[model samples]
Target: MKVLFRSDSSSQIGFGHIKRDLVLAKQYSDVSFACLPLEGSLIDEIPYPVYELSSESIYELINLIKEEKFELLIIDHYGISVDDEKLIKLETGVKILSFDDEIKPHHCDILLNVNAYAKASDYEGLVPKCEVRCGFSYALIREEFYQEAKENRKKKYDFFICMGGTDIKNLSLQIASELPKTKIISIATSSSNPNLKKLQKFAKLHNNIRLFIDHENIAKLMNESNKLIISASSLVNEALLLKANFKAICYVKNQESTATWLAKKGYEVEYKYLEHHHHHH
Candidate 1:
């Protein structure tokens, strides 16, 4: 039942991997973290010991795995390669369960691709696993959003711009600045984001916009605003299941596939600032 969750969260990498892994890890009694010791990495306040990797040497990580002897290794880090998984499996006898987005080749016992648009064929020969969980059914959305989803939403033509936990691309500012009179709630981070002051001042200056930062209850916010003008991040799954007014704008390399896939399926994933609504839901 013991597990070592490998993931990272920072300004550059963003927080989707670590955040979701942490949610899954919380269900297990014996779960620890193996992550990079980067400055401002989001592995500090966990309930378990985090073995920080200070070296590029994959052997160093395997060496720690030997010492810890975890029953399972849950990998959520994109940096960990297929060879890394092979090496980890070759070195340690622990079972590997990797969380992926169908981006590249992977090696693990149980592979989970929980993107809303994930397909089983994408990982056909990529991951060395028989048990592959794909598609929106495997999406790791929190209970809070699900709870909110069950409730009847009041649509007041209010818009929501929640571009993930780390708005590295400054999508919030661009969207917020344009929609001044419209009731808009944008998710922005004061930490790790380069344009926090501008975002905060914009929130302050505007009477119709509210900026939600480092939020603990985003589900409630999603509930408040039925319309989600978002990036092609994990929040898409939440909006999809909730059946809300959702739009996508691609700002990351990892997001292109999902964004495009969603765009084809009637959801507007492209940024159309001039368009009034994200295609009437």
Candidate 2:
């Protein structure tokens, strides 16, 4: 069966959508990708043939789909609205499957939100008889993480901080600045903070801090750290797998609902920070 995957990459929107599509594409060797091009230069990472589409030239995309006769279309772009989906469906008789983490109302045939805390029940009326694939059991993490999770169960954390792919808001620096004396390892993707050099300098000035950039082995890192401060993204699944004794703070408003639900389930601690007044017990 031929599949056409639609996703995007840009500075304002992180690369999670494309990244997850890549993971799924690897699982199905026959699948192809059609990506929306952005000037941000992140599209080069996709190994498959990427048919670049632009807002002005989107009509070309419809024509391309008409020609390709793809059996299925998988969309993972955050910017794509329901109108776009309806248009594509009208143009091509292909079935559309969407990847989503938040419980936003949408138009699609299948919706997959592979977060441990996501509830399929929440999307009961959002989409038209859509099949929801929710929970960590269906988490699209790489195989390496599952292997690491097995060994990581034996370890404990010292401290953890991950501010997502691009902490443009400088939340990492803010957190680090406040907890100056604490031994903590902060992780950020390579694209995060153009002021990283300044942050690195500050980390050096504070003897207890270590800053890691472009870290590919996050599963290993999360497995080793005891406590965690993380964004409510895919990292939630990793943290759940590691079973690390941790607290998670929701940095993004969309993540708040999922984070709060998970917190209520006793799987994570929901707090802004660990106050200095509380001694380590």
Candidate achieving the largest TM-score: 1
Q: Residue 17 CA error for candidate 2 (Å)?
A: 1.3
What range of 10 consecutive residues in model 1 has the weakest lDDT sum? 272-281
Error of 1 at 46 (Å): 2.3
Off by over 4 Å in 2: 56-58, 152-157, 186-188, 191-193, 267-281
lDDT agreement with native, every candidate: 0.76, 0.71
Q: What's the lDDT for candidate 1?
A: 0.76
Over 1-281, each residue of candidate 2 has an lDDT whose tens digit, in order, gives 68888777676677667777877787666687776676554678778778777553545767777888877888887767788778877878678898876778767888888777777887888887678887876787777788887783533336777767666555667666776485656555564455678778778887777677887787887887767777677777777777766666665566776787777887564444334332111
Report the error of model 2 at residue 147, Å: 1.0
TM-score for candidate 2: 0.86
Q: Name model 1 segments beyond 4 Å from true.
A: 180-192, 271-281
Checking candidate 1 for backbone clashes, the offending pairs are none
